């Protein structure tokens, strides 16, 4: 453990799994703590509305909704169900216990 340091959930990497990075490279847009990838390949203002910015986790979390010309991609941010496990610490408590 002290080398593992602690366990991973399939959870945490919602935009950090491979699929995040496939969607990243296919759109030439990269996670903030995420690596670089050079291109794979190479809009009226009055009629288009901005109330919130199309962010990169946005186009990265729905690649075909938010991106014109997305391709060569596998799937996107699909989430594993939430995990209601918390580390029981001390071996004296019952095996089965209510978390506060």
């Amino acid at each position: 453990g002290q080398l593992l340091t602690d366990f991973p959930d399939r959870n945490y990497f919602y935009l950090f799994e491979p699929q995040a990075f496939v969607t990243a490279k296919s759109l030439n847009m990269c996670i903030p703590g995420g690596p670089k990838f050079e291109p794979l390949f190479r809009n009226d203002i009055n009629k288009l509305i901005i109330r919130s910015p199309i962010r990169t986790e946005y186009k990265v979390a729905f690649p075909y909704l938010y991106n014109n010309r997305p391709r060569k991609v596998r799937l996107s941010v699909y989430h594993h169900p939430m995990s209601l496990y918390i580390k029981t610490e001390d071996p004296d408590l019952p095996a089965y216990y209510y978390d506060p």
Binding site: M29, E38, T56
Partner: peptide, 26 residues
């Protein structure tokens, strides 16, 4: 992150490829 700004490849241009946010933005 790369919220639609700048170089896609920081290889053949001559910088280290870091995109700092403006502390002067408003």
């Amino acid at each position: 992150m790369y919220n639609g700004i700048g170089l896609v490849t920081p290889r053949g241009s001559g910088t280290s490829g870091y995109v700092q946010g403006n502390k002067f933005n408003m």
